[PDB]
Symmetry: C3
Subunit: 125 residues, 3 copies
Protein backbone atom coordinates (compact mmCIF):
# COMPACT_ATOMS: atom_id res chain seq x y z
CA UNK A 1 0.00 0.00 0.00
CA UNK A 2 1.52 3.32 -1.22
CA UNK A 3 -1.52 5.40 -2.17
CA UNK A 4 -3.00 7.54 0.59
CA UNK A 5 -6.50 7.89 2.02
CA UNK A 6 -8.04 9.93 4.87
CA UNK A 7 -9.16 9.38 8.43
CA UNK A 8 -11.56 11.62 10.35
CA UNK A 9 -11.62 12.51 14.04
CA UNK A 10 -14.56 14.13 15.88
CA UNK A 11 -14.59 15.29 19.52
CA UNK A 12 -18.03 15.48 21.15
CA UNK A 13 -19.35 16.25 24.59
CA UNK A 14 -21.82 13.77 26.09
CA UNK A 15 -24.38 16.05 27.85
CA UNK A 16 -24.97 13.71 30.77
CA UNK A 17 -27.59 16.02 32.31
CA UNK A 18 -29.76 15.89 29.19
CA UNK A 19 -29.39 12.16 28.51
CA UNK A 20 -29.52 11.10 32.20
CA UNK A 21 -26.32 9.05 32.00
CA UNK A 22 -23.99 8.49 34.93
CA UNK A 23 -20.91 6.68 33.64
CA UNK A 24 -18.34 6.51 30.86
CA UNK A 25 -19.83 3.20 29.72
CA UNK A 26 -23.30 4.73 29.40
CA UNK A 27 -21.95 7.67 27.38
CA UNK A 28 -20.05 5.38 25.02
CA UNK A 29 -23.15 3.23 24.49
CA UNK A 30 -25.26 6.33 23.86
CA UNK A 31 -22.89 7.84 21.30
CA UNK A 32 -22.46 4.42 19.68
CA UNK A 33 -26.21 4.04 19.27
CA UNK A 34 -26.72 7.57 17.92
CA UNK A 35 -23.85 7.20 15.45
CA UNK A 36 -25.15 3.80 14.31
CA UNK A 37 -28.56 5.40 13.76
CA UNK A 38 -27.40 8.39 11.74
CA UNK A 39 -24.67 6.52 9.85
CA UNK A 40 -27.23 3.95 8.63
CA UNK A 41 -29.64 6.73 7.60
CA UNK A 42 -26.95 8.28 5.41
CA UNK A 43 -25.80 4.88 4.06
CA UNK A 44 -29.35 4.26 2.81
CA UNK A 45 -29.20 7.53 0.84
CA UNK A 46 -25.64 7.43 -0.54
CA UNK A 47 -24.10 3.95 -0.08
CA UNK A 48 -21.42 5.54 2.11
CA UNK A 49 -21.32 4.05 5.60
CA UNK A 50 -18.99 6.07 7.82
CA UNK A 51 -17.99 3.51 10.45
CA UNK A 52 -16.33 4.95 13.57
CA UNK A 53 -14.01 3.82 16.38
CA UNK A 54 -15.13 5.63 19.56
CA UNK A 55 -12.99 6.16 22.65
CA UNK A 56 -13.83 7.54 26.11
CA UNK A 57 -12.04 10.74 27.06
CA UNK A 58 -12.14 13.98 28.99
CA UNK A 59 -11.51 17.37 27.44
CA UNK A 60 -9.56 19.97 29.45
CA UNK A 61 -10.22 23.66 28.77
CA UNK A 62 -10.74 26.87 30.74
CA UNK A 63 -13.16 26.64 33.70
CA UNK A 64 -14.26 30.14 32.65
CA UNK A 65 -15.69 28.73 29.40
CA UNK A 66 -17.70 25.93 31.05
CA UNK A 67 -15.14 23.17 31.73
CA UNK A 68 -15.64 21.27 35.02
CA UNK A 69 -12.62 20.88 37.28
CA UNK A 70 -10.36 18.15 35.82
CA UNK A 71 -12.15 18.20 32.44
CA UNK A 72 -15.48 17.62 30.63
CA UNK A 73 -16.47 14.04 29.77
CA UNK A 74 -16.20 13.54 26.00
CA UNK A 75 -16.06 10.87 23.30
CA UNK A 76 -13.60 10.78 20.40
CA UNK A 77 -14.86 9.25 17.14
CA UNK A 78 -12.27 8.22 14.54
CA UNK A 79 -12.47 6.27 11.29
CA UNK A 80 -10.61 5.58 8.04
CA UNK A 81 -11.93 5.77 4.48
CA UNK A 82 -11.14 2.22 3.38
CA UNK A 83 -10.55 2.18 -0.38
CA UNK A 84 -12.12 -1.25 -0.66
CA UNK A 85 -15.42 0.37 0.41
CA UNK A 86 -15.01 4.02 -0.66
CA UNK A 87 -15.05 4.83 -4.39
CA UNK A 88 -15.01 8.62 -4.01
CA UNK A 89 -12.96 10.21 -1.21
CA UNK A 90 -14.50 13.68 -1.67
CA UNK A 91 -18.00 12.23 -1.33
CA UNK A 92 -16.84 10.38 1.79
CA UNK A 93 -15.50 13.67 3.20
CA UNK A 94 -18.83 15.41 2.53
CA UNK A 95 -20.61 12.55 4.29
CA UNK A 96 -18.38 12.75 7.38
CA UNK A 97 -19.04 16.49 7.55
CA UNK A 98 -22.79 15.94 7.22
CA UNK A 99 -22.74 13.34 10.01
CA UNK A 100 -20.57 15.52 12.27
CA UNK A 101 -23.14 18.33 12.06
CA UNK A 102 -25.93 15.83 12.75
CA UNK A 103 -24.04 14.34 15.72
CA UNK A 104 -23.56 17.88 17.06
CA UNK A 105 -27.33 18.39 16.84
CA UNK A 106 -28.26 14.98 18.31
CA UNK A 107 -25.84 15.43 21.24
CA UNK A 108 -27.03 19.05 21.83
CA UNK A 109 -23.45 20.36 21.56
CA UNK A 110 -22.76 24.06 21.15
CA UNK A 111 -19.51 23.54 19.21
CA UNK A 112 -17.82 20.51 17.64
CA UNK A 113 -14.51 19.75 15.88
CA UNK A 114 -14.07 17.41 12.90
CA UNK A 115 -10.58 16.83 11.50
CA UNK A 116 -9.25 15.02 8.43
CA UNK A 117 -5.75 13.51 8.49
CA UNK A 118 -3.87 11.85 5.63
CA UNK A 119 -3.15 8.19 6.29
CA UNK A 120 -1.79 5.12 4.51
CA UNK A 121 -4.11 2.16 5.12
CA UNK A 122 -2.90 -1.45 5.13
CA UNK A 123 -5.97 -3.70 5.27
CA UNK A 124 -5.53 -7.33 6.36
CA UNK A 125 -8.24 -9.79 5.50
CA UNK B 1 16.75 16.17 12.69
CA UNK B 2 13.33 17.77 12.53
CA UNK B 3 11.94 14.54 13.99
CA UNK B 4 9.94 13.63 10.85
CA UNK B 5 8.83 10.04 11.28
CA UNK B 6 5.81 7.72 11.27
CA UNK B 7 3.20 6.46 13.69
CA UNK B 8 0.99 3.42 13.27
CA UNK B 9 -2.54 2.77 14.42
CA UNK B 10 -4.27 -0.62 14.55
CA UNK B 11 -7.91 -1.38 15.41
CA UNK B 12 -8.60 -4.87 16.74
CA UNK B 13 -11.68 -6.67 18.02
CA UNK B 14 -11.41 -8.83 21.15
CA UNK B 15 -13.38 -12.04 20.26
CA UNK B 16 -15.48 -12.47 23.41
CA UNK B 17 -16.92 -15.66 21.94
CA UNK B 18 -13.35 -17.01 22.11
CA UNK B 19 -11.60 -15.39 25.08
CA UNK B 20 -14.69 -14.83 27.29
CA UNK B 21 -13.29 -11.68 28.88
CA UNK B 22 -15.89 -10.10 31.12
CA UNK B 23 -14.87 -6.41 31.24
CA UNK B 24 -13.23 -3.62 29.26
CA UNK B 25 -10.15 -3.81 31.50
CA UNK B 26 -9.76 -7.57 30.95
CA UNK B 27 -9.91 -7.05 27.16
CA UNK B 28 -7.25 -4.36 27.46
CA UNK B 29 -4.97 -6.65 29.47
CA UNK B 30 -5.63 -9.53 27.06
CA UNK B 31 -4.56 -7.47 24.03
CA UNK B 32 -1.69 -5.82 25.93
CA UNK B 33 -0.24 -9.15 27.05
CA UNK B 34 -0.49 -10.60 23.53
CA UNK B 35 1.18 -7.50 22.06
CA UNK B 36 3.93 -7.65 24.69
CA UNK B 37 4.62 -11.27 23.70
CA UNK B 38 4.73 -10.88 19.92
CA UNK B 39 6.61 -7.58 20.10
CA UNK B 40 9.35 -9.22 22.18
CA UNK B 41 9.54 -12.21 19.82
CA UNK B 42 10.11 -9.92 16.84
CA UNK B 43 12.58 -7.79 18.81
CA UNK B 44 14.72 -10.87 19.50
CA UNK B 45 14.94 -11.45 15.74
CA UNK B 46 15.30 -7.88 14.43
CA UNK B 47 16.28 -5.61 17.35
CA UNK B 48 13.13 -3.61 16.54
CA UNK B 49 10.70 -3.40 19.47
CA UNK B 50 7.39 -1.89 18.36
CA UNK B 51 5.98 -0.49 21.60
CA UNK B 52 2.28 0.39 21.53
CA UNK B 53 -0.08 2.71 23.39
CA UNK B 54 -3.41 0.85 23.69
CA UNK B 55 -6.84 2.40 24.28
CA UNK B 56 -10.26 0.91 25.00
CA UNK B 57 -12.91 1.61 22.38
CA UNK B 58 -16.12 0.58 20.69
CA UNK B 59 -16.32 0.26 16.92
CA UNK B 60 -19.64 1.18 15.32
CA UNK B 61 -20.82 -0.21 11.99
CA UNK B 62 -23.98 -1.58 10.38
CA UNK B 63 -25.92 -4.11 12.48
CA UNK B 64 -26.64 -5.82 9.15
CA UNK B 65 -22.91 -6.69 9.00
CA UNK B 66 -22.80 -8.20 12.50
CA UNK B 67 -22.19 -5.12 14.67
CA UNK B 68 -23.91 -5.35 18.08
CA UNK B 69 -26.31 -2.54 18.92
CA UNK B 70 -24.26 0.45 20.15
CA UNK B 71 -20.98 -1.03 18.83
CA UNK B 72 -18.41 -3.84 19.16
CA UNK B 73 -15.75 -3.80 21.90
CA UNK B 74 -12.36 -3.06 20.35
CA UNK B 75 -8.83 -1.94 21.22
CA UNK B 76 -6.83 0.75 19.39
CA UNK B 77 -3.02 0.32 19.35
CA UNK B 78 -0.82 3.28 18.39
CA UNK B 79 2.93 3.86 18.43
CA UNK B 80 5.62 6.13 17.04
CA UNK B 81 8.89 5.22 15.33
CA UNK B 82 11.36 6.98 17.64
CA UNK B 83 14.64 7.73 15.84
CA UNK B 84 16.34 7.32 19.23
CA UNK B 85 15.65 3.57 18.89
CA UNK B 86 14.90 3.12 15.18
CA UNK B 87 17.68 3.37 12.57
CA UNK B 88 15.59 2.34 9.53
CA UNK B 89 12.00 3.58 9.15
CA UNK B 90 11.25 1.06 6.40
CA UNK B 91 12.29 -1.95 8.47
CA UNK B 92 10.19 -0.59 11.35
CA UNK B 93 7.23 -0.26 9.00
CA UNK B 94 7.73 -3.84 7.82
CA UNK B 95 7.94 -4.92 11.47
CA UNK B 96 4.62 -3.19 12.32
CA UNK B 97 2.99 -4.90 9.34
CA UNK B 98 4.30 -8.29 10.47
CA UNK B 99 2.98 -7.68 14.00
CA UNK B 100 -0.43 -6.46 12.78
CA UNK B 101 -0.94 -9.69 10.83
CA UNK B 102 0.23 -11.68 13.84
CA UNK B 103 -2.15 -9.81 16.15
CA UNK B 104 -5.07 -10.40 13.77
CA UNK B 105 -4.34 -14.13 13.90
CA UNK B 106 -3.81 -14.32 17.66
CA UNK B 107 -7.00 -12.33 18.30
CA UNK B 108 -8.94 -14.54 15.81
CA UNK B 109 -10.16 -11.54 13.77
CA UNK B 110 -11.31 -11.78 10.17
CA UNK B 111 -10.21 -8.23 9.21
CA UNK B 112 -7.86 -5.66 10.75
CA UNK B 113 -6.83 -2.12 9.79
CA UNK B 114 -3.24 -0.87 10.13
CA UNK B 115 -2.56 2.78 9.28
CA UNK B 116 0.65 4.78 8.98
CA UNK B 117 0.52 8.54 9.57
CA UNK B 118 3.33 11.05 9.11
CA UNK B 119 4.33 12.73 12.35
CA UNK B 120 6.93 15.10 13.82
CA UNK B 121 8.23 13.61 17.06
CA UNK B 122 9.70 15.75 19.85
CA UNK B 123 11.24 13.42 22.42
CA UNK B 124 11.92 14.75 25.92
CA UNK B 125 14.32 12.85 28.17
CA UNK C 1 -3.21 20.64 5.62
CA UNK C 2 -4.68 23.71 7.18
CA UNK C 3 -3.39 23.35 10.78
CA UNK C 4 -1.70 21.13 13.41
CA UNK C 5 -2.66 18.82 16.24
CA UNK C 6 -0.40 17.53 19.02
CA UNK C 7 -0.36 14.22 20.82
CA UNK C 8 1.45 13.61 24.14
CA UNK C 9 1.86 10.25 25.90
CA UNK C 10 2.40 10.53 29.66
CA UNK C 11 2.83 8.07 32.48
CA UNK C 12 0.70 8.60 35.60
CA UNK C 13 3.24 7.74 38.36
CA UNK C 14 1.25 5.41 40.60
CA UNK C 15 4.16 5.29 43.04
CA UNK C 16 4.02 9.07 43.57
CA UNK C 17 0.32 10.06 43.26
CA UNK C 18 -1.36 6.86 44.58
CA UNK C 19 -4.36 6.80 42.24
CA UNK C 20 -6.48 3.65 42.42
CA UNK C 21 -8.18 3.56 39.00
CA UNK C 22 -7.88 4.78 35.44
CA UNK C 23 -10.65 7.29 36.20
CA UNK C 24 -8.58 8.79 39.04
CA UNK C 25 -5.41 8.95 36.91
CA UNK C 26 -7.33 10.70 34.16
CA UNK C 27 -8.64 13.32 36.62
CA UNK C 28 -5.17 13.79 38.11
CA UNK C 29 -3.57 14.46 34.74
CA UNK C 30 -6.52 16.59 33.65
CA UNK C 31 -6.35 18.81 36.73
CA UNK C 32 -2.61 19.30 36.28
CA UNK C 33 -3.02 20.23 32.61
CA UNK C 34 -5.92 22.56 33.40
CA UNK C 35 -3.71 24.52 35.82
CA UNK C 36 -0.68 24.84 33.55
CA UNK C 37 -2.79 25.69 30.50
CA UNK C 38 -4.63 28.41 32.45
CA UNK C 39 -1.36 29.90 33.73
CA UNK C 40 0.12 29.93 30.23
CA UNK C 41 -3.05 31.50 28.78
CA UNK C 42 -2.73 34.44 31.18
CA UNK C 43 0.81 35.03 29.85
CA UNK C 44 0.37 34.54 26.09
CA UNK C 45 -3.41 34.46 25.33
CA UNK C 46 -2.87 30.94 23.93
CA UNK C 47 -4.99 28.30 25.70
CA UNK C 48 -3.84 24.80 24.76
CA UNK C 49 -6.89 22.68 25.40
CA UNK C 50 -6.36 18.91 25.42
CA UNK C 51 -8.53 15.84 24.90
CA UNK C 52 -7.23 13.18 27.31
CA UNK C 53 -7.73 9.42 26.91
CA UNK C 54 -7.04 6.50 29.26
CA UNK C 55 -4.54 3.98 27.95
CA UNK C 56 -1.84 1.45 28.72
CA UNK C 57 1.57 1.52 27.08
CA UNK C 58 3.15 -1.83 26.25
CA UNK C 59 6.92 -2.24 26.07
CA UNK C 60 9.62 -4.66 27.18
CA UNK C 61 9.55 -5.90 30.77
CA UNK C 62 13.36 -5.61 30.62
CA UNK C 63 12.88 -1.82 30.45
CA UNK C 64 10.52 -1.53 33.41
CA UNK C 65 7.14 -2.25 31.83
CA UNK C 66 4.61 -4.07 34.05
CA UNK C 67 2.96 -7.17 32.66
CA UNK C 68 0.28 -6.13 30.11
CA UNK C 69 1.42 -2.49 30.06
CA UNK C 70 2.01 0.67 32.05
CA UNK C 71 -1.00 2.85 32.81
CA UNK C 72 -0.76 6.04 30.68
CA UNK C 73 -2.77 9.03 29.47
CA UNK C 74 -2.83 10.35 25.90
CA UNK C 75 -3.32 14.11 25.49
CA UNK C 76 -4.31 15.45 22.06
CA UNK C 77 -5.41 18.84 20.82
CA UNK C 78 -5.85 20.89 17.68
CA UNK C 79 -4.75 24.45 16.90
CA UNK C 80 -8.05 26.08 15.93
CA UNK C 81 -7.49 29.03 13.59
CA UNK C 82 -10.49 30.82 15.08
CA UNK C 83 -8.53 31.13 18.35
CA UNK C 84 -4.91 30.79 17.24
CA UNK C 85 -3.42 33.59 15.13
CA UNK C 86 0.14 32.22 15.14
CA UNK C 87 0.57 28.48 14.60
CA UNK C 88 4.30 28.61 15.33
CA UNK C 89 3.72 30.27 18.71
CA UNK C 90 1.06 27.66 19.49
CA UNK C 91 3.57 24.92 18.69
CA UNK C 92 6.13 26.56 20.99
CA UNK C 93 3.47 26.76 23.70
CA UNK C 94 2.56 23.07 23.35
CA UNK C 95 6.21 22.06 23.72
CA UNK C 96 6.50 24.34 26.77
CA UNK C 97 3.48 22.72 28.43
CA UNK C 98 4.56 19.19 27.51
CA UNK C 99 7.89 19.78 29.28
CA UNK C 100 6.07 21.24 32.29
CA UNK C 101 3.72 18.22 32.32
CA UNK C 102 6.71 15.85 32.24
CA UNK C 103 8.11 17.68 35.29
CA UNK C 104 4.87 17.79 37.30
CA UNK C 105 4.16 14.10 36.58
CA UNK C 106 7.76 13.16 37.55
CA UNK C 107 8.33 11.33 34.26
CA UNK C 108 11.75 10.39 32.90
CA UNK C 109 10.78 10.53 29.22
CA UNK C 110 7.82 11.83 27.25
CA UNK C 111 6.77 11.94 23.57
CA UNK C 112 5.16 15.00 21.98
CA UNK C 113 4.11 14.63 18.31
CA UNK C 114 2.73 17.13 15.81
CA UNK C 115 0.49 15.96 12.97
CA UNK C 116 -0.89 17.93 10.04
CA UNK C 117 -4.67 18.07 10.05
CA UNK C 118 -7.56 19.77 8.25
CA UNK C 119 -9.94 21.21 10.86
CA UNK C 120 -13.65 21.79 10.29
CA UNK C 121 -15.20 23.68 13.23
CA UNK C 122 -18.98 23.79 13.71
CA UNK C 123 -20.63 26.40 15.95
N1 LIG D 1 -17.74 1.24 6.68
C1 LIG D 1 -17.86 0.00 6.16
N2 LIG D 1 -17.44 -1.07 6.84
C2 LIG D 1 -17.58 -2.29 6.29
N3 LIG D 1 -18.10 -2.60 5.11
C3 LIG D 1 -18.51 -1.53 4.44
C4 LIG D 1 -18.43 -0.21 4.89
N4 LIG D 1 -18.96 0.65 3.95
C5 LIG D 1 -19.34 -0.12 2.97
N5 LIG D 1 -19.09 -1.45 3.19
C6 LIG D 1 -19.40 -2.56 2.32
O1 LIG D 1 -19.49 -2.12 0.97
C7 LIG D 1 -20.83 -2.41 0.51
C8 LIG D 1 -21.22 -1.53 -0.66
S1 LIG D 1 -21.45 0.22 -0.25
C9 LIG D 1 -20.06 1.00 -1.14
C10 LIG D 1 -20.32 0.98 -2.65
C11 LIG D 1 -19.24 1.72 -3.44
N6 LIG D 1 -17.93 1.14 -3.15
C12 LIG D 1 -19.29 3.23 -3.14
O2 LIG D 1 -18.24 3.73 -2.69
O3 LIG D 1 -20.33 3.87 -3.35
C13 LIG D 1 -21.66 -2.27 1.78
O4 LIG D 1 -22.95 -2.81 1.57
C14 LIG D 1 -20.78 -3.17 2.65
O5 LIG D 1 -20.86 -4.50 2.30
N1 LIG E 1 -10.28 18.74 18.96
C1 LIG E 1 -10.05 19.50 20.04
N2 LIG E 1 -8.79 19.78 20.41
C2 LIG E 1 -8.56 20.55 21.48
N3 LIG E 1 -9.49 21.08 22.28
C3 LIG E 1 -10.74 20.80 21.90
C4 LIG E 1 -11.10 20.01 20.82
N4 LIG E 1 -12.47 19.92 20.71
C5 LIG E 1 -12.93 20.63 21.72
N5 LIG E 1 -11.93 21.19 22.49
C6 LIG E 1 -12.06 22.02 23.67
O1 LIG E 1 -13.22 21.70 24.41
C7 LIG E 1 -14.22 22.72 24.28
C8 LIG E 1 -15.59 22.07 23.95
S1 LIG E 1 -16.20 20.97 25.27
C9 LIG E 1 -17.37 19.87 24.42
C10 LIG E 1 -18.38 20.73 23.69
C11 LIG E 1 -19.31 21.52 24.63
N6 LIG E 1 -19.90 20.64 25.64
C12 LIG E 1 -20.35 22.25 23.78
O2 LIG E 1 -21.55 22.01 23.91
O3 LIG E 1 -19.88 23.03 22.94
C13 LIG E 1 -13.68 23.68 23.21
O4 LIG E 1 -14.12 24.98 23.54
C14 LIG E 1 -12.16 23.52 23.37
O5 LIG E 1 -11.61 24.30 24.40
N1 LIG F 1 10.33 0.64 21.78
C1 LIG F 1 11.36 0.90 22.61
N2 LIG F 1 11.14 1.53 23.77
C2 LIG F 1 12.17 1.76 24.58
N3 LIG F 1 13.45 1.45 24.40
C3 LIG F 1 13.66 0.82 23.24
C4 LIG F 1 12.68 0.51 22.30
N4 LIG F 1 13.24 -0.14 21.22
C5 LIG F 1 14.51 -0.22 21.51
N5 LIG F 1 14.84 0.35 22.73
C6 LIG F 1 16.15 0.43 23.34
O1 LIG F 1 17.18 0.38 22.37
C7 LIG F 1 18.01 -0.77 22.64
C8 LIG F 1 18.78 -1.24 21.40
S1 LIG F 1 17.79 -2.02 20.09
C9 LIG F 1 18.80 -1.67 18.61
C10 LIG F 1 18.36 -0.34 18.02
C11 LIG F 1 19.06 -0.01 16.69
N6 LIG F 1 19.37 1.42 16.65
C12 LIG F 1 18.19 -0.46 15.49
O2 LIG F 1 17.45 0.34 14.90
O3 LIG F 1 18.30 -1.67 15.18
C13 LIG F 1 17.01 -1.74 23.23
O4 LIG F 1 17.67 -2.83 23.82
C14 LIG F 1 16.43 -0.76 24.26
O5 LIG F 1 17.31 -0.51 25.31
N1 LIG G 1 -10.01 1.86 11.30
C1 LIG G 1 -11.34 1.77 11.13
N2 LIG G 1 -12.05 2.87 10.79
C2 LIG G 1 -13.36 2.77 10.62
N3 LIG G 1 -14.10 1.67 10.76
C3 LIG G 1 -13.38 0.60 11.09
C4 LIG G 1 -12.02 0.55 11.31
N4 LIG G 1 -11.60 -0.73 11.64
C5 LIG G 1 -12.70 -1.43 11.63
N5 LIG G 1 -13.81 -0.69 11.31
C6 LIG G 1 -15.17 -1.13 11.22
O1 LIG G 1 -15.43 -2.24 12.05
C7 LIG G 1 -15.71 -3.42 11.26
C8 LIG G 1 -14.92 -4.60 11.82
S1 LIG G 1 -15.30 -5.07 13.52
C9 LIG G 1 -13.71 -5.67 14.15
C10 LIG G 1 -13.21 -6.90 13.38
C11 LIG G 1 -14.14 -8.14 13.46
N6 LIG G 1 -14.35 -8.58 14.85
C12 LIG G 1 -13.54 -9.27 12.61
O2 LIG G 1 -13.17 -10.26 13.26
O3 LIG G 1 -13.45 -9.15 11.38
C13 LIG G 1 -15.19 -3.04 9.88
O4 LIG G 1 -15.86 -3.80 8.91
C14 LIG G 1 -15.58 -1.56 9.80
O5 LIG G 1 -16.94 -1.37 9.56
N1 LIG H 1 -8.53 26.45 23.56
C1 LIG H 1 -9.60 27.22 23.38
N2 LIG H 1 -10.84 26.68 23.36
C2 LIG H 1 -11.91 27.46 23.20
N3 LIG H 1 -11.92 28.77 23.03
C3 LIG H 1 -10.69 29.29 23.05
C4 LIG H 1 -9.49 28.61 23.21
N4 LIG H 1 -8.42 29.47 23.18
C5 LIG H 1 -8.96 30.64 22.98
N5 LIG H 1 -10.32 30.60 22.89
C6 LIG H 1 -11.24 31.70 22.67
O1 LIG H 1 -10.53 32.85 22.27
C7 LIG H 1 -11.04 33.97 23.05
C8 LIG H 1 -10.05 35.13 23.08
S1 LIG H 1 -8.34 34.64 23.45
C9 LIG H 1 -7.58 34.51 21.78
C10 LIG H 1 -7.00 35.85 21.34
C11 LIG H 1 -6.30 35.85 19.96
N6 LIG H 1 -7.09 35.10 18.99
C12 LIG H 1 -4.87 35.32 20.09
O2 LIG H 1 -4.48 34.50 19.21
O3 LIG H 1 -4.17 35.70 21.02
C13 LIG H 1 -11.33 33.30 24.39
O4 LIG H 1 -12.16 34.15 25.14
C14 LIG H 1 -12.08 32.07 23.90
O5 LIG H 1 -13.41 32.38 23.57
N1 LIG I 1 4.35 7.58 21.65
C1 LIG I 1 4.78 6.35 21.96
N2 LIG I 1 4.64 5.35 21.06
C2 LIG I 1 5.08 4.12 21.37
N3 LIG I 1 5.65 3.73 22.50
C3 LIG I 1 5.77 4.73 23.38
C4 LIG I 1 5.37 6.04 23.20
N4 LIG I 1 5.65 6.80 24.31
C5 LIG I 1 6.20 5.96 25.14
N5 LIG I 1 6.28 4.69 24.64
C6 LIG I 1 6.85 3.53 25.27
O1 LIG I 1 6.67 3.57 26.67
C7 LIG I 1 7.93 3.81 27.35
C8 LIG I 1 7.75 4.90 28.42
S1 LIG I 1 6.59 4.43 29.73
C9 LIG I 1 5.93 6.07 30.21
C10 LIG I 1 7.07 6.98 30.66
C11 LIG I 1 7.75 6.53 31.96
N6 LIG I 1 6.77 6.39 33.04
C12 LIG I 1 8.90 7.52 32.27
O2 LIG I 1 8.79 8.20 33.31
O3 LIG I 1 9.84 7.63 31.48
C13 LIG I 1 8.94 4.13 26.24
O4 LIG I 1 10.20 3.60 26.62
C14 LIG I 1 8.36 3.39 25.03
O5 LIG I 1 8.75 2.06 25.03
Amino acid sequence: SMGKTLRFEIVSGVNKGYFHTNSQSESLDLVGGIWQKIAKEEFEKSNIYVSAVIKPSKTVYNQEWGCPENGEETVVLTGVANEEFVDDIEKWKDTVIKLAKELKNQMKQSTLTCEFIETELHYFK
